[PDB]
């Protein structure tokens, strides 16, 4: 009445299955060098890996576990340029951690600096209206310098403030400079925030520094399934429930092999 034997492989017959490999699922939105194959993908079954990382320049995703659940059942992501134009900033930051052929940065973000070292960063305002019929995933970043002088050298002296405004959201953010444990040879940090922009709605970024502006916006293609595993993928076997151990193949109404398996599955016992 309850299946106890599973398949030690991920049965990908009949469904579009993408093994993200060395890239974490959230990396597809920002675009580190390891998500260049999956900046725009479509899939029915997304498979994360333990080695995959959402990040190249050390940092974190704010509200990441909620966003990962959104991305796991997205059917993929489509991109579109938000058409931002700048005058009076460097607009081409780079870091040794995000390396393609030398120093680079996130493929979908743009690190904004002052023109020269310790020069001023002018107050700017950029807007983007979601023209499509689907909600637009929109991601921005806040760079925490390692010292007060680094933030002064990069974006100029004075207090920095980033404010994000939509029809259903409005909050301001501030960088906190300080020396943090060395991750990838760096103590600075870049934190990524996100929000959903409705159709015919306009996001608005007002800032004067320490702002990792987005270049493109993401859109969800459809529906999919998202698991993390270390098992191999099987193309000839067909399954409807999956977990970290593999594939659950059963007609019994119950099972007692995993408690959080996704997909059409028997109830946990």
């Amino acid at each position, epitope marked *: 009445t309850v299946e106890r034997t599973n398949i030690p492989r991920i049965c990908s017959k009949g469904k579009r299955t993408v093994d993200l490999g060395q890239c974490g699922l959230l990396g597809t939105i920002t675009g580190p060098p390891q998500c260049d194959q999956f900046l725009e993908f479509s899939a029915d079954l997304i498979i994360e890996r333990r080695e995959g990382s959402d990040v190249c320049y050390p940092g974190k995703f704010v509200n990441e576990e909620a966003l990962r659940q959104i991305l796991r059942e997205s059917g993929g992501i489509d991109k579109e340029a938000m058409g931002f134009t700048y005058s009076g900033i460097r607009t081409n930051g780079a870091t040794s951690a995000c390396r393609r052929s030398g120093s680079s940065f996130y493929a979908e973000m743009k690190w904004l600096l002052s023109n020269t070292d310790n020069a001023a960063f002018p107050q700017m305002t950029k807007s983007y209206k979601n023209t499509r019929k689907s909600p637009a995933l929109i991601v921005w970043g806040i760079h925490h310098s390692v010292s007060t002088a680094e933030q002064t050298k990069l974006y100029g002296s*004075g*207090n920095k*403030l980033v404010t994000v405004g939509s029809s*259903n959201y409005q*909050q*301001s953010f501030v960088p*906190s400079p300080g020396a943090r444990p060395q991750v990838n040879g760096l103590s600075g940090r870049i934190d990524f925030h996100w929000l959903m922009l409705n159709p015919n709605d306009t996001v608005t970024f007002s800032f004067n520094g320490a702002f990792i502006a987005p270049d493109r916006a993401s859109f969800l293609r459809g529906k999919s399934m998202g698991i993390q595993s270390g098992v191999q993928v099987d193309a000839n076997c067909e399954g409807d429930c999956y977990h970290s151990g593999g594939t659950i193949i059963s007609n019994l109404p119950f099972q007692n092999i995993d408690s959080r398996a996704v997909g059409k599955c028997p109830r946990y016992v």
Partner: antibody
Amino acid sequence: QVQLVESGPGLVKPSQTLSLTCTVSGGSINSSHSFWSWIRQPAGKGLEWIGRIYSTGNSNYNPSLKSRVTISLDTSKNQFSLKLSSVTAADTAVYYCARESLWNPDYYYYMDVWGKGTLVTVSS
Amino acid sequence: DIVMTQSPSSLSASVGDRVTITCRASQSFSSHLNWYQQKPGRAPDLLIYAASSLHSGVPSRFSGSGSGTDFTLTISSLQPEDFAVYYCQQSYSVPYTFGQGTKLQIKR
């Protein structure tokens, strides 16, 4: 130890501009992690967030009061002020200073310093 | 604006009881909720920020549980000096909104 003190007239006449002032002790008003805010409380009712301001001068006003609300700061005096225009009988309430701490690394903000509060009746 | 419906408008509990106050959101804002204790004639003092983390200086008998849209403030072993009105605050997006408040009265 940051401390806030309200200073302003105790009553204003109808259809006039109510003006208050917050004197911040124990810390600079150019702190990189402080949104200086105003919150009012009608006697016997609940709290109503009015607006906040940053050291840069950027402000956010409550949309209901945005038409009549102006918030400014005085970096030389270590103070910030609130001016409520076209005051009606409903604006009779207790008005509080407040400092919203942005120090949290996970971006969870909170009012951790409040002024004592100053009642402002409005009447002829 | 985010409406904050806060339940138990007024209540009576004896010294030592385990009082629970609930606050419910119109959205789901990943626990951007703060709790304040306002005694008579005073400004509200911050008890709990980020739903579950205690503010430094408040006693250990104040707890905060909650996920998504439903959050609860809990006072284990209620003491007579806990008589006050408690408010929940949404810290997700301005204009910030508060609950209607909960007057906690002591039964002796």
